């Protein structure tokens, strides 16, 4: 990951205005609505089967807060990406075998909702800067697959 200072300023200042519950609801929503393999967890979300169901689901917004709160633990501690996420890499295998292909998609999808929500500010490097942290996050959850 290790972004350049101007890239870091761009991603972390877009984070600084980010609506973590609604960008998270819409990141996790955006992923869930392709009907991909993550729809197998629709039963823990309790609503996903329609657009209005997933976009308004308090459990997709709340889980959105957890995935993106960890993504922020990334932007606070990019010197880790091996210890800050390790309990998550454990959860996301030793209790949830759920394939890290799913994490790559959530990651990719996250950059997209940020560019929806801040489309006047979505610069070519800010989205890539996001993707560098995100590819780190997917690789970090995948670390336990050594």
């Amino acid at each position: 990951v290790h972004l350049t200072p101007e890239e870091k300023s761009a991603v972390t200042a877009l984070w600084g205005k980010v609506n973590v519950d609604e960008v998270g609801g819409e990141a996790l929503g955006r992923l869930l609505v392709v009907y991909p393999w993550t729809q197998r967890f629709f039963e823990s979300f309790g609503d996903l089967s329609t657009p209005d169901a997933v976009m308004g689901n308090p459990k997709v917004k709340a889980h959105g807060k957890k995935v993106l709160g960890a993504f922020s633990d990334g932007l606070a501690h990019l010197d880790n990406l091996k210890g800050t996420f390790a309990t998550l890499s454990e959860l996301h295998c030793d209790k949830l075998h759920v394939d890290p292909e799913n994490f790559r998609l959530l990651g990719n999808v996250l950059v997209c909702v940020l560019a929806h929500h801040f489309g006047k500010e979505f610069t070519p490097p800010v989205q890539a800067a996001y993707q560098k942290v995100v590819a780190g996050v997917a690789n970090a959850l995948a670390h336990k697959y050594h």
Partner: protein, 141 residues
């Protein structure tokens, strides 16, 4: 959902699979545990202690569900639904795992069939097992 010639290559392969179907299912599971260590992360309640009475029985069930897929290959959307309701409503078994066991089947089939790697047979069994995945990973129906 599928193509006409793919069915013919599946019916041909599964025809020499015959009574061996359950053993190839059993081997494909053991192979997936060894060849994709991540499935040991699912915390299997199974023993895997060589010759396992549970793996031969699960192998026969996976195999009979493959026979059900062959028997209904354009008509299986609901015929594997009980197995979807398993892999989804219990354990959350990621459909990416299916691809791993399916590679493991293709390999075990190749250990007994003429080539198994032809365009007609490899494209077929990769995309057929992909539709067995797609249908095991159907929604409520």
């Amino acid at each position: 959902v599928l193509s006409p010639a793919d069915k013919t290559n599946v019916k041909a392969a599964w025809g020499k699979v015959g009574a061996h179907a359950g053993e190839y299912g059993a081997e494909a599971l053991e192979r997936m545990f060894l060849s994709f260590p991540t499935t040991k992360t699912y915390f299997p309640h199974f023993d895997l202690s060589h010759g396992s009475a549970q793996v031969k029985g699960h192998g026969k069930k996976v195999a009979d569900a493959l026979t059900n897929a062959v028997a209904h290959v354009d008509d299986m959307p609901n015929a594997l639904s009980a197995l979807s309701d398993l892999h989804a409503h219990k354990l959350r078994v990621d459909p990416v795992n299916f691809k791993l066991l399916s590679h493991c089947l293709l390999v075990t089939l190749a250990a007994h069939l003429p080539a198994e790697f032809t365009p007609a047979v490899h494209a077929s069994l990769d995309k057929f097992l992909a539709s067995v995945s797609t249908v095991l990973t159907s929604k409520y129906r």
